[PDB]
C-alpha cells in the first residue's frame, strides 16, 4: 500500500473509532462515504485469533 | 407482619383488596409491580423508600402491592 501511494484503511469493528465514522452507523457500508473521497484506497481486515 | 394471597387466576383477590379498601377507615395506598421499574440506576429504591416514609407519616396507613412476581423474581 505504501509503495503504490494508496490510502491505507483498516477496520476492526471497535467502538473508540465509531465516532469518526458516523453518529449511529447502523450499517457498515457507510465507511465508503469516507473512502471514495480518497479514491485510490485499500481496505484491510485481519481475522482475529478467535478463529 | 404481612399477608400474601395467591392462587389461580380468576378468583376474588383484587375483589377482597377493594372490599378491604372500602370498609376500612385508615389511609390506603395502591401499588403495582411494574410501576417500580425505572430506567436510571438508583431511581427505583428511592420511590420505595419515599412511599414507605409517606405511609409512616400518617400512622394507620396500609399498602397493597399487586402483581408481586414482576419484581420479586
Amino acid at each position: 500500500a505504501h509503495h503504490t501511494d494508496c490510502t491505507f484503511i483498516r477496520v476492526s469493528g471497535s467502538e473508540l473509532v465509531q465516532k469518526f465514522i458516523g453518529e449511529g452507523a447502523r450499517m457498515v457500508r457507510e465507511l465508503f462515504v469516507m473512502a471514495r473521497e480518497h479514491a485510490p484506497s485499500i481496505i484491510f481486515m485481519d481475522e482475529i485469533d478467535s478463529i | 407482619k404481612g399477608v400474601l394471597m395467591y392462587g389461580p387466576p380468576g378468583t376474588g383477590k383484587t375483589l377482597l383488596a377493594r372490599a378491604c379498601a372500602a370498609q376500612t377507615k385508615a389511609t390506603f395506598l395502591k401499588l403495582a409491580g411494574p410501576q417500580l421499574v425505572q430506567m436510571f440506576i438508583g431511581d427505583g429504591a428511592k420511590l420505595v423508600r419515599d412511599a414507605f416514609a409517606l405511609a409512616k407519616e400518617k400512622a394507620p396507613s396500609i399498602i397493597f402491592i399487586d402483581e408481586l412476581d414482576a419484581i420479586g423474581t
Binding site: 471497535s14 467502538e15 473508540l16 465509531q18 465516532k19 453518529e23 | -
Partner: protein, 279 residues
C-alpha cells in the same frame, strides 16, 4: 517618555484573572485559547509578555471581562501531587518479598536501569520500553512489588486510581490527565503509577448514555498524551490490572505498552521460601 509609557499597561492584571489553557497561535499577538469555563475563544495577546514561554499546553491567565490573554503562569497541578516521602514511604523492603525473583528482575530491567544507565541502552540500541503491564490472579504480589519499588526508588513517584478521573462536572477528566502528565514531565525523571485500569479502559462504549462519552474522551486524551513523548524524557508508566481479558487492544500497541508481566500461583519451590520468609 517611552520608558514611562511602557509601564502604564500593567493596569489590567490586578484582580481580574481566570486560568486557561493555551491552544493555538494563528499569528502574532493573536491566539485561540480554551478557558476552564467550558468554551473556547479567539483573543488578542498582550504585547510585553515573552512569546518564548508559550508552549503547546502551557497554562495562562486571562482578563475576566475582556477575556484577553494577559499572563503566563508557572507549572501547576492538582490530584495526587508528589507522594512527599514523609508519611508516604511505605516501609516495605525487597527482603520481605520472597520467591518471585524472575518478575523482580524483569521489573528491575524494564524500569530502574533505563532511568540510571541510559547510555548503555542507547549504545547497544535496544529502545527501552515506555510502560509495563501486570496481570494475573488476585493475591500474588503486584501491589507489594509496586510498594517496594516506591520505597527503594530515588525518583519522583506519582500514584493514582483509575476510578478518580470521572467527575460530576464535565471537562475535568482530560484536564486532570494532561495536568498529571505535565507535572510529571516538567518536574523530574518521575514514575507514574495507575491502579486497576479496568475502571476506564474497557471495550464496550455506548454513545447515548452520557457517561460513556466522558469515559471515551478521558481514554482518548490518555492515548493522545501518552503518545506525545519524544523518546527523550525519562518517564515510566506502571499500570496494574486484574482482569486482563476486558481491555481495549488499542492500548497495547507498541510505544504504549511494550512489556507484559504475569504473576502466577506458586507451585512447589516458592511455597517454602514464602513460609520461611513470613515465619
Amino acid at each position: 517618555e517611552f520608558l514611562h509609557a511602557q509601564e502604564e499597561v500593567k493596569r489590567i492584571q490586578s484582580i481580574p484573572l481566570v486560568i486557561g489553557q493555551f491552544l493555538e497561535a494563528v499569528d502574532q499577538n493573536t491566539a485561540i485559547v480554551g478557558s476552564t469555563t467550558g468554551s473556547n475563544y479567539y483573543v488578542r495577546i498582550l504585547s510585553t509578555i515573552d512569546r518564548e514561554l508559550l508552549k503547546p499546553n502551557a497554562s495562562v491567565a486571562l482578563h475576566k471581562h475582556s477575556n484577553a490573554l494577559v499572563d503566563v503562569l508557572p507549572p501547576e497541578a492538582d490530584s495526587s501531587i508528589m507522594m512527599l516521602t514523609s508519611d508516604q514511604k511505605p516501609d516495605v523492603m525487597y527482603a520481605d518479598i520472597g520467591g518471585m525473583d524472575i518478575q523482580k528482575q524483569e521489573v528491575r530491567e524494564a524500569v530502574e536501569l533505563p532511568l540510571t544507565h541510559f547510555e548503555l541502552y542507547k549504545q547497544i540500541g535496544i529502545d527501552p520500553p515506555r510502560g509495563v503491564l501486570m496481570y494475573g490472579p488476585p493475591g500474588c504480589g503486584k501491589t507489594m512489588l509496586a510498594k517496594a519499588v516506591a520505597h527503594h526508588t530515588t525518583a519522583a513517584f506519582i500514584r493514582v486510581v483509575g476510578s478518580e478521573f470521572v467527575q460530576k462536572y464535565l471537562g475535568e477528566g482530560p484536564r486532570m490527565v494532561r495536568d498529571v502528565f505535565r507535572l510529571a514531565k516538567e518536574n523530574a525523571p518521575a514514575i507514574i503509577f495507575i491502579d486497576e485500569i479496568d475502571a476506564i479502559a474497557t471495550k464496550r462504549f455506548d454513545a447515548q448514555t452520557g457517561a460513556d462519552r466522558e469515559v471515551q474522551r478521558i481514554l482518548l486524551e490518555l492515548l493522545n498524551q501518552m503518545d506525545g513523548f519524544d523518546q527523550n524524557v525519562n518517564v515510566k508508566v506502571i499500570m496494574a490490572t486484574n482482569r486482563a481479558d476486558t481491555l481495549d487492544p488499542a492500548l497495547l500497541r507498541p510505544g504504549r505498552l511494550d512489556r507484559k508481566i504475569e504473576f502466577p500461583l506458586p507451585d512447589r519451590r516458592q511455597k517454602r521460601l514464602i513460609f520461611s520468609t513470613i515465619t
